[PDB]
Every structure is written in C-alpha cells, then in structure tokens.
Design a protein around this ligand. Structure first.
Ligand SMILES: Cc1cc2nc3c(=O)[nH]c(=O)nc-3n(C[C@H](O)[C@H](O)[C@H](O)COP(=O)(O)OP(=O)(O)OC[C@H]3O[C@@H](n4cnc5c(N)ncnc54)[C@H](O)[C@@H]3O)c2cc1C
Length: 456
DNA sequence: CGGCTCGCGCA
DNA sequence: TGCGCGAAGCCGAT
C-alpha cells in the first residue's frame, strides 16, 4: 500500500473488503510509542493515500487486575506522555475501557473508519480479540510487526528448535529489514481521561499491593520511570557507559551493566530496531556488541516465534519430547524441600541466594538476567510437580516483573523448566536431564555475598 | 557427524 | 577468573 521507505513484508492483510470513506484507525496494543513505530507509520501512509486523517485507539482492559500497581503505573504514565506526543502531530488518541473485541468494533462503526491497523503480538488473547473484531467489522483489517526487526511470519515458518538454527535465518534477512525510520508526518485534517482511569485503577489494586512487616510497600518506583523520553535516555547511557563492559559483565548481578531496556521494550516505549541501529554504529568492544546483538535480535524475536507457533507456550505440552519423558520419569522422586506459592512469593526458602533474588524482584520490579535462571530452576527442584513449578514461576513472573506478561517471559520460563531451546544434560534426581544450576556454581562466577547482602 | 546461551578441576 | 572437559539428545547440512 504505497510508500517508498516502507517494506510491504512488514504488513499483512487480516481481512479484505471495500475501503471506507472515513479516517484510518490504528489499534495500538504492544508498541506504545510515537517514534520508530512501523504500525503507526504504515497507518499514516494509508491515511495520506486516501486523503483521510489517522486516529489512534487504545483499549484499556481488565488485565491490570492480574498484575499490580508497578505495571499499571508504568504503562499509564507512558500513555499520558504519548498522548502529548501524538497531540503535537495533530493525531488523536482515544482511550476506551472494556473488551477490545466489542469496543473496537463499536468504535469502527461509530467513527466511520475506513481502514483498521493494529500491531503484532503472538499472545493468545490478542488472537481472540482479533477474531472478535473480524466478525464485527466490514472495513479492511491490517497488521504490522512493529516490535521485531524482521517480521515474525517472515523470519521462520516453523517453531525453531534452537538459536543456532534460527541464527542463520535472522542474520540473512538483516540487510533487507534493518533500515532507518522515516519521520512521522503530522496530520493535515484534524477530526476518557487518563488521569481518571489511573486513580480508579490504583484504588482497585491497592489491597493486592506487596507489603512489608510494617505495612510498607516493597516496590521502589524510582529505579525506572516510564515514558518514551525516559526509554531513550536508558538506551543512550547503555551505549556510552555500559555497552563496552557488557560482554564480560553481563552475568554478574553485583554489577549493574545490563541495558535495563526490558520494561520499555515490553510496553513498546522504545523500538528494538532503533536500539540495533545505534548499537551497530557504535565503536564499542566487538565481543560485547556481538553478545548484545544476539540477545535483543536472536533471543528476543525467537520468543515471539515460540509463542506464535505454539499456542500452549505456557504449558507442559510445549516442552520437547526428551524433556517431557525425563520430567515424567522423576515425578515420584522425593524432593529435598516442598514450598508453596506463598512461601516462594515471600522469599521464605532455605536458600539465601534464592530469597535474595526474589527480593530484587519484589523491590525493583526487575531481577538480574543471570539470577532469573537460578530463581526459576530452583522452583522446579522444590515443587510438587513440574506443572506446579510452571504455574508458580509464571505467576510470580507475570505479577512482579515489570517486563512480565511477555513472550520473552514464557519462552524464558520454558527454557529453565522445560528445556525449550536447550539440550539435555547430566541425569539427576527430580530435575532429571534439565540443565542444572547450583549455589556453588554461582559462587565461583560472582560475589554471591554481595548479592545476598544487597537485598537482605 | 558437528555443535549446541551448565558444573567442575585446574593455573 | 579463565579454560578445557564432561554429559547428554537432537537438528540439519549432506
Ligand atoms: C525465568 C526467566 C524469566 C524471564 N522473564 C522475563 C520477562 O517476564 N520479560 C522479559 O522481557 N524478559 C524476561 N526474561 C528474559 C531476561 O531475563 C530479561 O529480558 C532481561 O534480564 C532484562 O534485563 P535487561 O533488558 O537489562 O537485559 P539485557 O542483557 O540488557 O538484554 C537486552 C534485551 O535483550 C532481550 N533479552 C535478554 N535476555 C533475554 C532472554 N534470556 N530471553 C529473551 N530475551 C532476552 C530483552 O528484550 C532485553 O531487554 C526472563 C528470563 C528468565 C530466565
């Protein structure tokens, strides 16, 4: 659909029909940003070709009840900043409350939409919302992959077994899909309160807030303030100050040398393609650049591939045959310790390293990338069954992680418990052939005493 | 057949 | 800390 600096492979037609005579409507779900947005740049071009304005719709759902205030305030505060940014380019933002499957279809007919465009997401709920809108609209419906550098359907047409099989496919398509972002052209034809929806949300999530003994909340919101502007500063400081030492100190939780970009990347407050563009042109350490590029390109977009081609990505069935047979044979094995969800949530285990890792999660909303493996693998070792281990790990991940409810989370949890995108290892009791990590293993790689003392 | 994102003994 | 090896099942380039 027109456009010079616009690859048609990033878009795909979800429905066909006659184009309406009204404005094009962009359904923003995953990429909550105004700059470096392919789903928004594509919508503007269709608006420009049809001589119609472009509108923006965001449907606030009841999914915030499953999460806490840490994720609600992070998403809401960025939307208020995004509302101002879109207002500077004569683009209107409409915020709705309810089911997108019924409110979006009502918004298309009420506003007389000509075309409908949305961003890509491999989650189950999004496909259910799309099918509901599909049956309630008669205007063309398009979808743009504005999250991945290479479109998910274009990178691979099959659930990839490992990264070493997905690595040659992604890097072969990089010279085509890795490109600069054209500027967002403002509108030519111009035609709920976010503050009110913020107070009503925190009031409904107050009783479920994480608290300490003295009735003091555990979350510390000053570590990462949200917003598109704040996401840029974190990226800029990483390239200039933390990119050089990334390849050597990425597995040390005592050193704050990670990019800290997941909370912004999950909500779409910054484009991962923009991160690649600035990282590629930076004169850093070559070993650190390759290590970082493999993390945000191969392992971030293969999680989308995992959830897209596996509808049961958060279940035991999505595990490989070798892991399922290994875990089933050790179901009756006696566990050294058995902890419930509440004991894992409050950090009441015998391991001071695991408890400290959970405290970093409960205090900052983000846990170090290295300790997340030990946090999840120890749940499998100290649970009733692999199903309960998967349930506890997913619950604690989606409730307290700022980057939770993400394809990176489900793939990452399935890696630690089900060996997805991994291989077999030494045979052990309970865990079987799943990769094993011990407290002594972390002792020889980083100062464990510094990590435990930092988070009580 | 070669190589995959741990623990372990050893400088 | 950094390095080579062990231990394990399997994809895919042929
Ligand atoms: C059990 C478990 C659960 C996880 N939960 C989540 C989650 O809920 N949300 C989430 O976004 N990530 C999750 N991850 C992935 C990883 O822990 C985080 O992406 C990372 O630790 C966030 O810190 P960072 O962005 O500073 O890391 P960096 O080293 O700076 O990574 C840069 C970016 O690369 C990507 N990335 C890095 N490591 C991974 C990985 N292992 N898998 C996929 N993408 C990766 C992310 O987009 C990240 O923002 C989890 C990992 C594990 C093992």
């Amino acid at each position: 659909p027109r456009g010079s600096h616009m690859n048609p492979k990033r878009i795909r037609a979800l429905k066909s029909g006659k184009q309406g005579d009204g404005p094009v409507v962009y359904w923003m779900s995953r990429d909550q940003r105004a700059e470096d947005n392919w789903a928004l740049l594509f919508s503007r071009a269709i608006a420009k070709e049809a001589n119609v304005p472009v509108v923006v719709v965001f449907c606030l759902t009841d999914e915030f009840l499953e999460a806490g205030i840490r994720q609600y305030e992070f998403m809401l505060k960025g939307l208020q900043e995004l509302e101002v940014s879109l207002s500077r380019k004569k683009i209107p933002s409409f915020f709705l409350r309810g089911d997108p499957g019924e409110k979006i279809s009502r918004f298309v007919k009420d506003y007389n939409a000509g075309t409908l465009v949305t961003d890509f997401s491999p989650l189950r709920i999004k496909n259910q919302w799309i099918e509901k809108v599909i049956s309630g609209i008669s205007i063309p419906f398009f979808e743009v992959d504005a999250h991945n550098v290479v479109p998910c359907w274009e990178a691979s047409q099959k659930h990839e077994y490992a990264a070493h099989t997905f690595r040659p496919k992604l890097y072969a398509l990089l010279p085509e899909f890795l490109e600069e972002f054209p500027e967002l052209e403002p509108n030519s034809v111009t035609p709920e309160t976010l503050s009110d929806v913020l107070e009503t949300g925190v009031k409904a999530l107050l009783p479920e807030r994480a608290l300490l003994k003295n009735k003091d909340p555990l979350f510390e919101p000053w570590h990462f303030e949200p917003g598109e502007k704040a996401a840029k500063k974190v990226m800029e400081s990483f390239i200039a100050d933390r990119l050089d030492s990334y390849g050597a100190l990425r597995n040390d939780p005592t050193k704050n040398m990670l990019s800290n970009l997941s909370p912004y990347l999950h909500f779409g407050q910054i484009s991962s393609q923009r991160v690649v563009l600035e990282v590629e042109k930076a004169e850093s350490n070559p070993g650190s650049k390759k290590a970082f590029l493999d993390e945000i390109l191969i392992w971030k977009e293969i999680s989308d591939n995992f959830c897209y081609y596996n509808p049961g990505y958060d279940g035991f069935e999505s595990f490989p045959s070798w892991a399922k047979e290994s875990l089933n044979a050790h179901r009756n094995d006696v566990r050294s310790h058995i902890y419930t969800l509440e004991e894992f949530e409050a950090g009441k285990t015998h391991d001071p390293l695991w408890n400290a890792s959970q405290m970093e999660l409960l205090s900052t909303g983000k846990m170090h990338g290295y300790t997340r493996m030990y946090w999840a693998k120890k749940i499998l070792e100290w649970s009733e069954s692999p199903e309960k281990a998967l349930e506890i790990a997913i619950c604690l991940n989606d409730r307290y992680e700022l980057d939770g409810r993400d394809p990176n989370g489900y793939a990452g949890i399935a890696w630690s418990i089900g060996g997805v995108h991994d291989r077999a290892w030494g045979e052990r009791e309970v865990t079987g052939k799943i990769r094993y990590m011990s407290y002594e293993g972390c002792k020889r790689k980083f100062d464990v005493k510094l990590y435990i003392e930092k988070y009580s």
